[PDB]
Amino acid sequence: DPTFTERGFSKTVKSDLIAMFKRHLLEHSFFLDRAENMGSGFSQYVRSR
Amino acid sequence: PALSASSRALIDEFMSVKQTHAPIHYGHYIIEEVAPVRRILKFGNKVVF
Amino acid sequence: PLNRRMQYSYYFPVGLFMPNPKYTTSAAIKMLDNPTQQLPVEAWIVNKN
Amino acid sequence: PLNRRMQYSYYFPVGLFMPNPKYTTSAAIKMLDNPTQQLPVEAWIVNKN
C-alpha cells in the first residue's frame, strides 16, 4: 500500500511500519479460524482478504 | 482530551467495562478518550470502542 | 494529494486534585491505602501501539 | 510443502511483584491471606491439551 511508503525511506516510516506489522500479525492472519467463528459475514470476509 | 488516567487501576477498570466504569475514583480519576479518530484500544483480548 | 494529514492537538492533565468531599462511582476498586489523603503523582496515557 | 512450520515464540514471566499501592479489579474473589504482603512465586500456564 503506497500510502505508507514512497514518501521518503527514513527511520520514521519504517519505525512506524514495524508497529504496523505487529498490529497486522494479530487481526489478519489465520483468517479461517476467524471465519469459522465469525458471524453471518462468512463469504464477504474471505472475498475481502 | 486524550486518554489519561492516574494509576493502572482505573485503566484496567475502564478496559473492563467501558459503560459502567468510574470516571472519578476517590482521589483518582480517568478521562475518557473523545477524539475525531475514535481509536481502538487493545488490552489483551479485552478491546473496546 | 487526497492523502492529506490533519494535525489534531490532544491534551491531558497530570497531577490534579479533587475537592475534599471525595466520592466513588465503582463498587469494585478499593485501593489498599488510606484513600482520603490520596493524590496522583503521574499519568498513564496510551500510545498508537 | 504448503505444510510450513511457523515457530511463534511465546514468553511469560514468573516471580514478578506489584508496586506498593495495591488494589483490586473484581470484588467477587477473596483469598484467606493478609492481602498486602504476598508474592507470586509459581506460575500456572495452559498446555496444548
Give structural notes.
- It is classed as viral protein.
- This is part of a larger assembly, with 4 copies of chain A (49 residues).
- The relative contact order of chain A is 0.10.
- The first copy, chain A, has helices spanning 11-27, 31-35, 43-48.
- Chain A is mostly helical.
- Chain B binds chain C through residues 1-11, 13, 20-29, 31, 33, 35-37, 39, 41, and chain C through 6, 8, 10-14, 16-18, 22-26, 28-29, 31, 35-40, 42-46.
What is the compact description of this entry?
This is part of a larger assembly, with four copies of chain A (49 residues). The first copy, chain A, is mostly helical and 49 residues long.
Roughly how much helix do the residues of chain A carry, as a percent range?
Answer: 55-70%
Largest sheet of chain A: none
Q: Encode the helix/strand succession of chain A as letters.
A: HHH
- Overall structural class of chain A, as computed from helix and strand content, comes to mainly alpha
**Which quaternary structure do these chains form?**
part of a larger assembly
Helix count, DSSP H or I runs of 4 or more residues of chain A: 3
Largest Cβ-defined interface: B-C, 29 and 29 residues
Rg of chain A is 15 Å
Q: How much of the sequence of chain A is in beta strands?
A: under 5%
Distance between the amino and carboxyl termini of chain A:
14 Å
Counted beta strands of chain A: 0
Global morphology of chain A: elongated
